[PDB]
Design a protein around this ligand. Structure first.
Ligand SMILES: CC(C)(COP(=O)(O)OP(=O)(O)OC[C@H]1O[C@@H](n2cnc3c(N)ncnc32)[C@H](O)[C@@H]1OP(=O)(O)O)[C@@H](O)C(=O)NCCC(=O)NCCSC(=O)c1ccccc1
Ligand code: SF4
Lengths: 438, 375
């Protein structure tokens, strides 16, 4: 079947080890007097990093996704949250997280480790409600950064002021909650590391534009996750640099993630974590998923490049912009995060429609498989308008219903049959095109 | 019987006839508004009629291509009204940011309703508890004023804004005065009558609506009450605009004496503070208003507001009406329920689709009333 050379990733084991160490560090944070905090993967984690090198987060959505990979434990956690009285149609990550806190069990062993404080970003409505319940049940201080200032391309000075001024409140909050003095040098280092890691993850994804794709999306789920754990850490920034070197070498050598690659797919949001085997099934057709706006930009930070293409955002110091003081760092850090592609559709779904159409073009995509994800209001808003814009463009597109965290709303059998039908459709379209353009 | 509230009922039933005729009488534009946070003072100052989009509570099959069915019935029912052409007389559409689901109604409407000539999204801060939110919203309200001045080509002066705020504040004060009558043992205003008044405030010219509120208040001191009060209920939820459902509740042996919902109290509760910078007065009125759950963090200030209303209006039982899939109110529900019950107010939970057979709800209400009879 295999037209292309293929090779397994050399840095795979390190990617798995860094993730395991992150989770073990959170649990062991108190052995040497460290700080623990919890919040979204979208929290501005450089702020707590100004309190020391022994400040360990637990990001809520990646943790809940880890639980969702264990169907039995995920079921138990959701049953506990339901017994408390929460509606079953709330965010499945949030329900899993709540249930595991009530059960007092950590997915990586032991009791559920109590955070010292909540440090959260609010853009999805459930961002507040998730940690309001946690902070009451753990009796801990809580801080929320309201980033709801509308699309980055419409940004005003006052909108940026609102986010920057809240971040200064956040500094005061984490000092009070932890009892430590915030250090400008550690903070600036963390801002710079977050800029590095998020831009570099984008650089790696942009390498997937070539045929054959050096990475498949299932492999990428174990790589994009590191920025969702601690994007402002030195370890994450340095690993993104190492990974970029490996993927560059794969491109240089013509290496394919999928040796029989013939069809390039794009997905969208939050895949069903206990059903990633669907991607291996697609590989039997010679289909590889090259990524998604979700994989590329849940944390990756992007810009338009000199040729009009999409690439990692330029680091300020490569642009003559110095970061030498707290106030400059805070404003640039706010601006960096407000450019996040995966925040724009909370205001205007056509921004995401255009972003998806651009990915289809630049990554040379043959077909799109859209998850209508009942488990996540925040990433699903606007999904049907995105589908319509893709349908109008002429690129084949199918949908399937599911839930990234709650298997009870995902039908494996029906979804696999729809995906099979889609593979047939792509073959038919190829035959018709060949016949017309003989 | 006496028909005192008949004008509000006519305005509700014939809301679209009203707007078309308003355009004939004034020559002004009509703006479809979404979410009660819309700074209507600016629209009124620009010579426009704000009309809140609401659903029709009928079966509809037009929204499936635009909004996925995991989202609430209200956001879909609302969008359907635009797609069906029922707001074809509205040149503008505007939403002020709160719940993310409702943002889809706005986005799909501006893209697909072909009679839309202009649109505007106001990113009002969600964290009204932040010390920086009022400055941010001051600037958002000023920016919308500048947009509207540009759109109409007519300067919107501070005097024009102050007059519009005065009309809105008068409406807010008159609706609060109407609600005060609900505290009596035999309320001269039923929950359905209050609902007709507070909902029509959101799509009738406020000067005309104020005149009708003042006529209503002139009549109340001597209004003969014939019905029995029954149990004193409070209704809680997001929108709660199904008047027909509320009429059933008040037909089984109860009166809805107070509410926590955007068809009612959460829309109008507070007037602006006296203040010489009219943009600050307008922006802060909305930041200081009882908060949508989405805007209620880090503290659940809503819980104190709901319990306070329940005690001040002598509530005996609280009914949560929840739209299917409503994340902001679902997130608050278990602890708000506990807060009311721990303070002596039994509660009932009812969940709603776009349409629902009324019978099963009536049985649940009748059973709740029996529980109030006990302990
Ligand atoms: C740990 C899982 C879940 C599973 O990992 P898996 O890889 O499936 O399983 P295993 O670990 O057991 O390993 C077995 C596999 O290793 C493969 N293999 C072996 N050697 C190599 C090699 N050298 N190279 C390449 N591959 C190699 C081998 O083929 C085998 O695969 P197969 O059996 O053939 O198919 C991983 O996907 C993950 O971390 N996902 C991220 C979850 C998460 O936290 N996401 C963030 C959510 S945040 C969010 O949503 C959000 C945030 C904010 C706002 C809103 C939303
Ligand atoms: S619904 Fe989605 S975006 Fe919102 S809290 Fe859950 S995971 Fe985050």
């Amino acid at each position: 079947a295999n037209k292309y050379p293929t090779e397994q990733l050399k840095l795979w084991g390190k990617a798995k080890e860094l993730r395991e160490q992150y989770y073990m560090n959170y649990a062991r944070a108190k052995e040497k007097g460290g700080i623990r905090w919890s919040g979204s993967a979208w929290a501005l984690d450089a702020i707590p990093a100004g309190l020391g090198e022994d400040v360990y987060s637990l990001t809520g959505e990646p943790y809940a996704a880890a639980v969702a990979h264990d169907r039995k434990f995920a079921k138990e956690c959701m049953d506990a949250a339901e017994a408390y009285g929460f509606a079953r149609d709330l965010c499945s990550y949030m329900r899993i997280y709540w249930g595991g806190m009530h059960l007092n069990k950590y997915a990586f062993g032991g009791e559920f480790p109590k955070p010292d404080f909540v440090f959260q970003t609010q853009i999805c409505c459930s961002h507040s409600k998730w940690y309001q319940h946690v902070a009451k049940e753990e009796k801990i201080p809580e801080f929320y950064l309201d980033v709801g200032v509308g699309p980055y391309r419409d940004m005003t000075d006052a909108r940026l002021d609102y986010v920057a001024n809240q971040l200064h409140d956040g500094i005061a909050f984490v000092e009070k909650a932890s009892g430590r003095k915030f250090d400008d040098e550690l903070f600036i280092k963390a801002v710079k590391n977050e800029m590095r890691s998020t831009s570099r993850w984008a650089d790696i994804c942009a390498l997937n534009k070539v045929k054959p794709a050096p990475l498949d999306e299932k492999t990428m789920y174990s790589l994009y996750v590191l920025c969702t754990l601690s994007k402002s850490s030195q370890w994450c920034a340095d690993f993104m640099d190492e990974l970029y070197e490996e993927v560059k070498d794969r491109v240089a050598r013509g290496i394919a993630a999928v040796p029989n690659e013939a069809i390039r797919l794009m997905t969208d949001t939050q895949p069903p974590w206990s059903f990633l085997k669907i991607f291996r099934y697609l590989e039997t057709y010679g289909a590889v998923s090259i990524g998604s706006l979700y994989t590329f930009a849940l944390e990756g930070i992007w810009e338009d490049k000199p040729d009009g293409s999409w690439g990692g955002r330029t680091l300020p110091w490569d642009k003559g912009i110095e970061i030498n003081d707290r106030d400059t760092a805070v404003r640039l850090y706010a601006d960096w995060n407000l450019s996040k592609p995966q925040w724009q559709h909370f205001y205007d779904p056509t921004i995401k429609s255009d972003m998806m159409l651009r990915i289809i073009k630049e990554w040379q995509v043959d077909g799109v498989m859209l998850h209508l994800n009942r488990g996540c209001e925040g990433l699903s808003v606007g999904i049907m308008e995105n589908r319509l814009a893709i349908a109008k463009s002429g690129t084949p597109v199918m949908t399937f219903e599911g839930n990234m965290g709650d298997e009870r709303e995902f039908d494996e059998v029906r979804t696999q049959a729809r995906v099979d039908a889609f593979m047939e459709q792509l073959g038919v379209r190829r035959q018709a095109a060949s016949a017309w353009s003989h | 019987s006496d028909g005192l509230f008949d004008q509000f009922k006519t305005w509700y039933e014939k809301r679209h006839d009203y707007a078309r005729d308003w355009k004939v009488r004034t020559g002004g534009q009509v703006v479809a508004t979404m979410c009660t946070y819309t700074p209507e003072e600016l629209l009124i100052a620009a010579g426009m009629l704000p009309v809140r989009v609401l659903g029709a509570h009928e079966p509809q099959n037009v929204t499936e291509p635009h909004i996925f069915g995991m989202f609430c019935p209200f956001c879909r029912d609302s969008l359907a009204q635009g797609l069906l052409g029922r707001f074809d007389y509205a040149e503008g559409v505007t939403l002020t940011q709160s719940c993310i689901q409702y943002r889809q109604t706005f986005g799909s409407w501006r893209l697909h309703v072909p009679t839309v000539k202009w649109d505007y999204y106001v990113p009002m801060p969600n964290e009204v508890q932040s010390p920086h939110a009022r400055k941010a919203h001051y600037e958002e309200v000023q920016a919308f004023r500048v947009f509207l001045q540009t759109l109409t080509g007519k300067e919107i002066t501070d005097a024009m804004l102050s007059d519009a705020l005065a009309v809105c504040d008068e409406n807010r004060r008159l609706l609060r005065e109407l609600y005060e009558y609900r505290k009596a043992a035999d309320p001269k205003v039923t929950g359905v009558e209050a609902l007709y008044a507070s909902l029509t405030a959101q799509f009738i010219d406020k000067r005309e609506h104020n005149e009708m509120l003042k006529k209503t208040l002139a009549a109340l001191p001597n209004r003969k009450v014939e019905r029995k009060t029954g149990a004193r209920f409070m209704t809680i939820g997001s929108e709660n605009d199904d008047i027909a459902f509320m009429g059933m509740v008040e037909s089984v042996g109860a009166t809805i004496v107070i509410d926590d919902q955007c068809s009612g109290s959460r829309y109008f509760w507070n007037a602006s503070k006296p203040e010489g910078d009219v943009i600050k007065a307008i922006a802060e009125r909305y930041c200081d208003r009882p908060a949508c759950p989405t805007k209620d963090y880090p503290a659940h200030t809503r819980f104190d507001h709901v319990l306070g209303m329940a005690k001040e209006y002598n509530v005996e039982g609280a009914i949560f009406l929840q739209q299917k899939f409503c994340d902001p109110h679902e997130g608050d529900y278990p602890d708000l329920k506990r807060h009311l019950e721990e303070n002596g107010i039994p509660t009932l939970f009812l969940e709603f689709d776009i349409t629902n057979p009324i019978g099963p709800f009536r049985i649940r209400i009748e059973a709740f009333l029996e529980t109030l009879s006990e302990e």
